[PDB]
Amino acid sequence: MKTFEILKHLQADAIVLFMKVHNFHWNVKGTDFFNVHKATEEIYEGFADMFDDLAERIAQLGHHPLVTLSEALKLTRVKEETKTSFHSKDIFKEILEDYKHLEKEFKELSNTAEKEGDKVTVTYADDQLAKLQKSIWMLQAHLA
Amino acid sequence: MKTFEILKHLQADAIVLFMKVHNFHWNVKGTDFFNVHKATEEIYEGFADMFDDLAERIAQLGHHPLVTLSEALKLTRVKEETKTSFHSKDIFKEILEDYKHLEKEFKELSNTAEKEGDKVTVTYADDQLAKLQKSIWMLQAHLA
Amino acid sequence: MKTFEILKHLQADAIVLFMKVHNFHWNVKGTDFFNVHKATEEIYEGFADMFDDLAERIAQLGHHPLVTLSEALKLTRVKEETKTSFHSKDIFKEILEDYKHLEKEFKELSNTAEKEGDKVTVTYADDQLAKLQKSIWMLQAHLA
Amino acid sequence: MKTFEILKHLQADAIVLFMKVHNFHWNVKGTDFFNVHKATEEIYEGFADMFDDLAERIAQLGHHPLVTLSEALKLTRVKEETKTSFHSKDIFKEILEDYKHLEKEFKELSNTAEKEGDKVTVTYADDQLAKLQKSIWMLQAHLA
Amino acid sequence: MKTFEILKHLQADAIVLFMKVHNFHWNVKGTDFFNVHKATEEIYEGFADMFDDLAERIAQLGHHPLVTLSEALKLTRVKEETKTSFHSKDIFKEILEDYKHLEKEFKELSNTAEKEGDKVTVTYADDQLAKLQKSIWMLQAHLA
Amino acid sequence: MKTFEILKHLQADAIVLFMKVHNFHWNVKGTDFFNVHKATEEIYEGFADMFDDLAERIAQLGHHPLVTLSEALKLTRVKEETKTSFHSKDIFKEILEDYKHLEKEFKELSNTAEKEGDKVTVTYADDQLAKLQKSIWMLQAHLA
Amino acid sequence: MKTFEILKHLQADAIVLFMKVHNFHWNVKGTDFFNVHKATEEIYEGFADMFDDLAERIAQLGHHPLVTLSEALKLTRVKEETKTSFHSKDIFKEILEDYKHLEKEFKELSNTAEKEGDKVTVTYADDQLAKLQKSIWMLQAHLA
Amino acid sequence: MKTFEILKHLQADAIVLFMKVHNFHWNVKGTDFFNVHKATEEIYEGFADMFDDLAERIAQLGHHPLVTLSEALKLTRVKEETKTSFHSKDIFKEILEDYKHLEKEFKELSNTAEKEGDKVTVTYADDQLAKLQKSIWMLQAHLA
Amino acid sequence: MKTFEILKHLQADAIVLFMKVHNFHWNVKGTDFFNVHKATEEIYEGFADMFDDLAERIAQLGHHPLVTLSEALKLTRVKEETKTSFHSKDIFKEILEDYKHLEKEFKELSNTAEKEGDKVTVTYADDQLAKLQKSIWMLQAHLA
Amino acid sequence: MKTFEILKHLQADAIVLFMKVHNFHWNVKGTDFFNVHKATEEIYEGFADMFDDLAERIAQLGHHPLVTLSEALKLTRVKEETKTSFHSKDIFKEILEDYKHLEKEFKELSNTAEKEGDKVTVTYADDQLAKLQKSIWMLQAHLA
Amino acid sequence: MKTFEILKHLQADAIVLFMKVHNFHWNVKGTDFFNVHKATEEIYEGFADMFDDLAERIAQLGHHPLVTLSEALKLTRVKEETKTSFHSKDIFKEILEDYKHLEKEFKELSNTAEKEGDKVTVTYADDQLAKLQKSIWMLQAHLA
Amino acid sequence: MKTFEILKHLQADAIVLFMKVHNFHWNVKGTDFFNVHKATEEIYEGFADMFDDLAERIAQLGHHPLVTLSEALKLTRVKEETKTSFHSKDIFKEILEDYKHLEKEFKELSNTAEKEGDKVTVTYADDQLAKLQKSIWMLQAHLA
């Protein structure tokens, strides 16, 4: 895909992941409620920020960001979670895999943008890689 | 509808309106760009906050908030805007009508919750009414 | 009176009371100067804030707030004080009675607005009642 | 009971619950020490704030708040806990039930005050209901 | 006029101009609503601050500041505006002329106070001149 | 008494004195209302902080702080005040004597802890002595 | 006197007045202790700031500020107060007269500096006049 | 050009553009005065910051930054604007073209520095590209 | 010269002096590097602020501030420094003389503006005199 | 040992314990990752601060603090941990024992310094005792 | 001497040392002007704070602090410096010796107060010892 | 070396350099004490931060950071300084060479990580290069 296409598919993923973790946040139960409730809040707010950042990047490239939730559902690589009951460990296992997916895509974003000479998208992509790698490391350690 | 049902339909409206104004924000053009760009940012962030507030309210009542974007599209009373080109005046005219819709619904929320003896949802609903009435007044004055 | 009429008469009272306490502030003498000088500053600034709040409320209802000081003098229930010399105790006795008047009127505002289904003016009115009741309690205790 | 009587019994409950959770705070042991130690600090400080708020409300109504700890023990509906050893889960189970008791009483406070036309106590009571409902929801989720 | 007399007439102008711009603020309509609404807020708050400053100056000179709104209407050189409908350009044109009037008067204040050896009123007057000259320059540029 | 016993009796005094001054705070009347109302707020908040500090100290020594208000009433050296009406001078006279009592006890706390080699309780005790001596000096000067 | 000589005599007065009010501060007794204790703190800190300001002004003119307390006692127009017991009213009466003295001297400072074309000392002097006139007005009102 | 030469020519452009927009800032007239006046302030301050940043970069490379305004005029690619009267739209059109020029040059800076293995200048250059691309996007949207 | 002409020549000096000290800042060497590097930063930022202040003053008088760097070089009384190597002492000696020049000119500005009845430029000029006199005093002391 | 010798051995312990807990911090795994990761960060930063404090104390006594890591390893009483895998409970058990060691040593520091009349080291030592006793109490409670 | 007598002699020293270093501050010349000018400001402000602290301590003990500068000159152990010209090194050498004197006296203060059982003066004295020892160490290192 | 190996050797250097500059900090003497004392504090805190940053980077790559000070001494390229006496110039000369070493290594880190496609370590490395180049430039200028 071209840079702007990778960006638009990521923007779709971001809002879908926002919604998914928003769902986790309100439906988490058990002895680790307070840590997971707080963590999921930070995680979905991060996806919301990513949604905004990606839109900004698409616009600056001269293209239209996502127009509708319908378009987000069309472009997303992320499956919608319909469950309302889950274990806290499974939540973090799920989020971890979503992080690993995003990491793969941002690496591709970085490589594709560099080939096009899009220096600004490279910077953005590599900065997101840094944030993702920290998040992945912590979740992996927690689940170890 | 029962209180929690009104709340869930509002939560659906909130995210759909977030997306709609997010679209306006990135696609606004013309001599009033800077004022409308800034205003639309504040407006969609307000809808995002409403989304969170409504979810909180639904959860505290012992029900599940929206689980997916699919469910949001199912429950919403708001039509998705597919356009990417518009005049700044039309943006504010659209948002005004959306505000008027939300005002009607929050009034119903307030009345229904009071009848059920749900004092906390009444407070929340009336506070949202206050915010909506200010927003409506300003947009009406601007378009006058 | 209708809600907006009660509001406009209150707005008139607010500016007249602002002026009255502004006069007290600059003309207070005696051993309790520093406490009364400071208290009267806080009191007239409170009336100034009320003036603004009431104007906002009238405008949002689709009516015109006070246009002139002439109109304020016409609508006010508060007598203008022409004196420049007084005792600090008499100042607080006067202000107390003005507070009691405002309390009566805001109670009426709350009841009238509720009957009209004006939920936002009810909230505003009850919040002002809270502030007035605290002020009344302190002045009563001071004069006891 | 009249409004001021409900308020005085609540003020008694507040200080007794402050003491109870203060005891929990200093005597909690085990792997969840740090979360429960911190949570119990926030909880007893909340009861201390409630004690102050209720006193303020009683005074403004023209009555005397609690004068002594003896009077608090006389009026309280809350049993004093003499234990110094407990499990962290039992602490939260206890606090939950105390919250549910307070919720019942504040609902009664709200209804009784409204019938008397005491608009300010209604506002206070409904605001406390909001805080209690959030606390109850979180504890219920944690214990689920 | 003597210094204190110029000051008292200015104090009268300040509150009358406060009221006038307060009226503009709530009644402004049209595409430049948000800029004019905000500007008029800053302008009337400036007149309110001037009212306070002038009162302080009169008191420190051993005289009584304005006692009533009646006295303000008697002493003012500013005509009360009864209109509730106007164009945003006309608002700024009006305010500009009011600024030019105030500038003339503060220049006289400065000259008269210097002749009397009132060094403190000179400083105050010249500082107000600075603020007025900035405001005039901006309004003139806007209307050019 | 041993260190922890002195500490527990002080903790009992702290909450009883909190309650006593809380009572003074809400029931003070007269021309010095505002100064005494504010002073009594600071004083009872100081006793509340002392209650917390003493509990912390007892716990760190490996003992249980006060468990109940019943236990506080058993251990206290302070008489409960049942009055609701008093003069502001008598309030400060009472508090002064309570301060002098606390000063005696903290001196004993310091001496006893030093003999036991409890260096941390010595530091705490001497710091409280400093705070008490300032408070005593001011009240003595006020009543002189 | 020349400008720098007026400044040096003022610097001497400032430290002597600092000491005088420092003495008042620590020795004030009676029912108005807390207000006078606080006021005297602000007053002596003001004289300390004046001491620094005057030194700065003398240095910038190419002269040496006060070198010793001996030199301050030599140059001062202010009598040292040896008393340790006084009434709070007498304190404010004394300070008032000291303010009136400083006012006379700063007026002379302003006039002398202007004649020499020392524009910076004029600004400083007139600013100090403003501060003195406010202080005088408040003390006069308090003693009225 | 070598890296340091590109940097020095950019530093020259920065100060010339600072001056140009400084001129626009003070000479802008018309109904959009307040937005353009504010925007031009932010724009020239940005060029001033760029001037400083570029100087820092040149120095760290072991070369001398611009020594004089004469040298800036010699090295600049930007034409000096002698006009004092213009339309607000033309101002933004001009600035846009200047931004596009700077964008071209910073891209070259980034490429040249990378070829030399100057990793720090690459980072700086790409960061400036990001800022320029945002500015260009907004001006383009405004003029669309 | 007329006031606005003195101001425009000063504005020219300000930017030329900014550039001169900017050059010193980046080229200073030796054991006092860190103090001189920091001092020169503060000094050139001061000249930059003066440039802005003078422009503001010229505009408010109804004239055009400097339009170009060419015009600055034409109007300046300050010689451009082409050197890149110097001793830190010589830097401060140079800056001192530039300060003394500015002091002479601002004194003339103050006198000329007063004769014209331009009270606002007098205030500005005298305030700048104060800042210059402090700077001169410190540099003189350092070089003594 | 003399005071300075106890201090130098403590400084050695501090850096060795810093390193040990730094190792724990990065290698902690499991369901309590986030609490232990955060706690270990605070703990090693505390040891780093202690390292600095002890160095300061040694220097002020006229001796040289630790010069090298070699010297730290020579003087330390703490065994280096070579493991990279451990349970979170064992981490806290280890740290607890290290705290108990430090407590013993700081008690000796306090006693030895007092005998020498080193009042400042006594204060420092007793303050560290306070911090250690809190830390010990919390870890003991957590492991209970 | 008794505790209060040591304190009063120290209070005398504090103001005399304030004056001495105030003199140094304004009369320092040479290449190290900026460091010594700043250091002497911090030093004399420290002596001013000590003056206040000592007065507080004397008052709390039931005695009168210094009443006059005459009494300060009578009680002081510090010789007044009449010089206006000195080297920066000599300034620090002088201050060092003054610090060493204060250190001796505060050690005596600590010992004497402990013998009297004055725990609060011991704490104060030892805290001042800490501050003095840091200051001495830095000056000694600077002069080494 | 592989990326993680370069990182681990750098982490070893960081703590060894921390210790070295910590030693300089406490043992610096002479007329430039205050500047060098402060500079060395900032420098060793920078090395401490680098130690933490490098550990984070190693962990995120799935490897173990330094476990012990023994391992740091094994891996370090930096010679331990045993001296306690030195000239301030020699300190900065030493630190400069250490900076130049770190610069070489971070350049290698950047190149090696890029070849491996480790985009996050490249960003980190280049950011550290920027910080090092600034530090080197300042030290070189100071020693010139």
- The DSSP code sequence of G81-136 is P--S---HHHHHHHHHHHHHHHHHHHHHHHHHHHHTT-HHHHHHHHHHHHHHHHHH
Q: Cite the DSSP H helix spans in J61-118.
A: 69-75, 88-115
The CA-atom distances, in angstroms, between K71 and each of B144, G23, H87, I36 are: 77, 12, 74, 45
Q: What's the CA gap between A114 and A126, in Å, rounded?
A: 11
Decide if E142 and H30 are in contact by the 8 Å CB cutoff.
yes
Q: What's the CA gap between L96 and L102, in Å, rounded?
A: 10
Three-state helix/strand/coil letters over J21-77: HHHHHHHCCCCCHHHHHHHHHHHHHHHHHHHHHHHHHHHHCCCCCCCCHHHHHHHCC
Decide if B141 and E31 are in contact by the 8 Å CB cutoff.
no
Q: What single letter denotes the amino acid at residue J104? A: K
Q: What single letter denotes the amino acid at residue K88? A: S
Q: How many residues does chain B have?
A: 144
From G56, G57, G36, G45, select the one nearest G18 (Cα to Cα).
G45
I118 backbone dihedrals φ, ψ, rounded to 5°: -85, 85
Q: What's the CA gap between G38 and G25, in Å, rounded?
A: 8
From L40, L125, L132, select the one nearest L90 (Cα to Cα).
L40
Q: What's the CA gap between D43 and L4, in Å, rounded?
A: 47
Q: Which residue of L has its CA nearest to A135?
A: L60
Q: Helices I3-27 and I33-60, interaxial angle, to 10°? A: 160
- Centre a 10 Å sphere on the Cβ of residue B85 and count the other Cβ atoms it contains: 9
Q: Which residue of L has its CA nearest to A137?
A: L60
Decide if C144 and F29 are in contact by the 8 Å CB cutoff.
yes
From B62, A32, A40, A90, select the one nearest D142 (Cα to Cα).
A32
Q: What's the CA gap between H114 and D5, in Å, rounded?
A: 79
Nearest to G144 among C29, C34, C35 (CB): C29
CB G12 within 8 A of CB G66: yes
Q: What's the CA gap between A59 and A4, in Å, rounded?
A: 9
CB E85 within 8 A of CB E23: no
DSSP for residue D64: -
**Which residues in chain L precede a discontinuity of more than 2.5 Å between C and N?**
none
Angle at K75 between CA K73 and CA K81, to 5 degrees: 40
DSSP for residue L82: -
Q: What single letter denotes the amino acid at residue B127? A: D
Q: What's the CA gap between L62 and G92, in Å, rounded?
A: 74
First-to-last C-alpha distance (Å) of chain A: 35
Decide: helix, strand or coil at residue F12.
Answer: helix
H or E segment to which residue B103 belongs: helix B88-115
Q: What's the CA gap between E26 and C53, in Å, rounded?
A: 12
The answer to whether the Cα torsion of C76, C79, C81, C86 is positive or negative is negative
And the tokens for B96? Answer: 């005004």
Decide: helix, strand or coil at residue A116.
Answer: coil
Q: Do chains D and C touch (3 or more CB pairs under 8 A)?
A: yes
The answer to whether the Cα torsion of A86, A88, A94, A99 is positive or negative is positive
CB H37 within 8 A of CB E144: no
Q: What's the CA gap between G6 and G1, in Å, rounded?
A: 6
The CA-atom distances, in angstroms, between F127 and each of A125, K75, K122 are: 55, 30, 11
For residue L23, the domain's CATH number is 1.20.1260.10
Angle at C82 between CA C81 and CA C88, to 5 degrees: 65
Decide if A120 and H107 are in contact by the 8 Å CB cutoff.
no
Q: What's the CA gap between C63 and B102, in Å, rounded?
A: 22
Q: Which residue of J has its CA nearest to D27?
A: J141
Q: Is E53 exposed, middle or buried (0-12, 13-18, 19+ CB in 10 A)?
A: middle
Could you give the number of structural domains in chain K?
1
Angle at K61 between CA K58 and CA K66, to 5 degrees: 25
CB J23 within 8 A of CB L59: no
From J126, J27, J11, J22, select the one nearest J64 (Cα to Cα).
J11
First-to-last C-alpha distance (Å) of chain I: 35
Greatest C-alpha distance within chain I: 50
Output b/e per residue, G89-122; b: 16+ Cβ within 10 A. Answer: eebbeebbebbeebbebbbebbebbbeeebbbbb
Contacts of B108 (CB under 8 A, 6+ apart): B6
- Centre a 10 Å sphere on the Cβ of residue K118 and count the other Cβ atoms it contains: 22
H or E segment to which residue H117 belongs: none
Q: What's the CA gap between L78 and L100, in Å, rounded?
A: 12
User: Cα dihedral angle (F3, F5, F7, F10), rounded to 10 degrees?
Assistant: -140
**G113 at the I interface (CB within 8 A)?**
no
Tell which J residues from 57 to 96 touch D, by Cβ distance under 8 Å.
89
Q: What's the CA gap between J102 and F62, in Å, rounded?
A: 19
Contacts of E56 (CB under 8 A, 6+ apart): C26
The CA-atom distances, in angstroms, between C24 and each of C13, C29, C84, F32, K81 are: 16, 10, 8, 20, 53
Q: What's the CA gap between G107 and B99, in Å, rounded?
A: 63
Separation in Å, CA of D61 to nearest CA in chain A: 39
CB D13 within 8 A of CB D105: yes
Q: What's the CA gap between L107 and C26, in Å, rounded?
A: 71
Q: Which residue of J has its CA nearest to D34?
A: J142
Decide if C67 and E16 are in contact by the 8 Å CB cutoff.
no
Q: What's the CA gap between C105 and C112, in Å, rounded?
A: 10
Place of tokens 């500096």: G113
Angle at F22 between CA F19 and CA F28, to 5 degrees: 135
Separation in Å, CA of C3 to nearest CA in chain D: 17
**B35 at the D interface (CB within 8 A)?**
no
Q: Is I74 exposed, middle or buried (0-12, 13-18, 19+ CB in 10 A)?
A: exposed
**Chain J residue numbers touching D34 (CB-CB < 8 A):** 35, 39, 138, 142
Q: What single letter denotes the amino acid at residue H35? A: N
Decide if F141 and G37 are in contact by the 8 Å CB cutoff.
yes
Contacts of E99 (CB under 8 A, 6+ apart): E132, E135, E136, E139
Long-range contacts of K103-106 (CB under 8 A, 24+ apart): K103/K129, K103/K132, K103/K133, K103/K136, K105/K6, K105/K9, K105/K10, K105/K13, K106/K10, K106/K132
CB L3 within 8 A of CB L112: yes
Nearest to A60 among H126, H127, H137 (CB): H137
Q: What single letter denotes the amino acid at residue H90? A: D
Q: What's the CA gap between A133 and A54, in Å, rounded?
A: 18
Angle at I51 between CA I47 and CA I56, to 5 degrees: 145
Decide if B120 and D130 are in contact by the 8 Å CB cutoff.
yes
Q: Do chains K and E touch (3 or more CB pairs under 8 A)?
A: no
Place of tokens 């204190």: E4
C121 backbone dihedrals φ, ψ, rounded to 5°: -70, -35
The answer to whether the Cα torsion of K73, K74, K76, K77 is positive or negative is positive
Identify the experimental approach: X-ray
Q: Is A140 exposed, middle or buried (0-12, 13-18, 19+ CB in 10 A)?
A: middle
J35 backbone dihedrals φ, ψ, rounded to 5°: -75, -40
Place of tokens 């003499």: D82
H or E segment to which residue K44 belongs: helix K33-60
Q: What's the CA gap between F71 and F69, in Å, rounded?
A: 5
Angle at A44 between CA B120 and CA A34, to 5 degrees: 60
CB H102 within 8 A of CB H35: no
Q: Give chain H's count of helices (H) and strands (E).
A: 5, 0
CB pairs under 8 A between C and F: 19
From L53, L143, L42, L61, select the one nearest L106 (Cα to Cα).
L53
Q: What's the CA gap between G55 and H85, in Å, rounded?
A: 50
Q: What's the CA gap between C66 and E69, in Å, rounded?
A: 14
Q: What's the CA gap between I74 and D83, in Å, rounded?
A: 89
Residue L111, domain extent: 1-144
Q: What's the CA gap between H6 and H80, in Å, rounded?
A: 20
Q: Which residue of K has its CA nearest to F110?
A: K119
